[PDB]
Design a protein around this ligand. Structure first.
Ligand SMILES: CC(C)C(=O)NCc1nc2ccccc2[nH]1
Length: 164
């Protein structure tokens, strides 16, 4: 079960943690992946989660895309959590580094409301280029279900908590 999290709101918790190590420890019902529309888990959170599954996440994802086509920015799909969780909710936040509308970040977080409890990264943060302080703000103002945020960088985690 989730431990060592700092409570930010009624339903939002945060921890300086590697989401892969956190998923391996917690084995949550849902781990959120910071996905792209093609489910190409190359780097960032997606690359790390996929590597932890021995590429099984990518094999499953390629079958999903072959059948369904790409996701929408702001959208999601539920796939297996493999060895990390029961399910992985692949959520596509806007990639500011590809010029995508930051306004889609709230739509991306709305996917979390379909799950009672989730282990997640900050959407659109990291290699997706958005301000993580903004991402946390949208998370707290959009997600109503119980979200346990894992923030990999200690320095960013401290900035997020101290500026909340
Ligand atoms: C499991 C450990 C050894 C690992 O794969 N580290 C690499 C790594 N990169 C990350 C990016 C975002 C979030 C978590 C990330 N982890």
């Amino acid at each position: 079960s989730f431990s060592g999290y700092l409570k930010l709101t009624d339903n939002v918790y945060i921890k300086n943690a590697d989401i892969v190590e956190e998923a391996k420890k917690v084995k949550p019902t849902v781990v959120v992946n910071a996905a792209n529309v093609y489910l190409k888990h190359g780097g960032g959170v997606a690359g790390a989660l996929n590597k932890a599954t021995n590429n099984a996440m990518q094999v499953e994802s390629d079958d999903y895309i072959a059948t369904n086509g790409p996701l929408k920015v702001g959208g999601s799909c539920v796939l297996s959590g493999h060895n990390l969780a029961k399910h992985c909710l692949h959520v596509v936040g806007p990639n500011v580094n590809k010029g995508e509308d930051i306004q889609l970040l709230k739509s991306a977080y709305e996917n979390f409301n379909q799950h009672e409890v989730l282990l997640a990264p900050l959407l659109s943060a990291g290699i997706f280029g958005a301000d993580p302080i903004h991402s946390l703000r949208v998370c707290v103002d959009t997600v109503r279900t119980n979200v346990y945020l894992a923030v990999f960088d200690k320095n960013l985690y401290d900035k997020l908590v101290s500026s909340f």
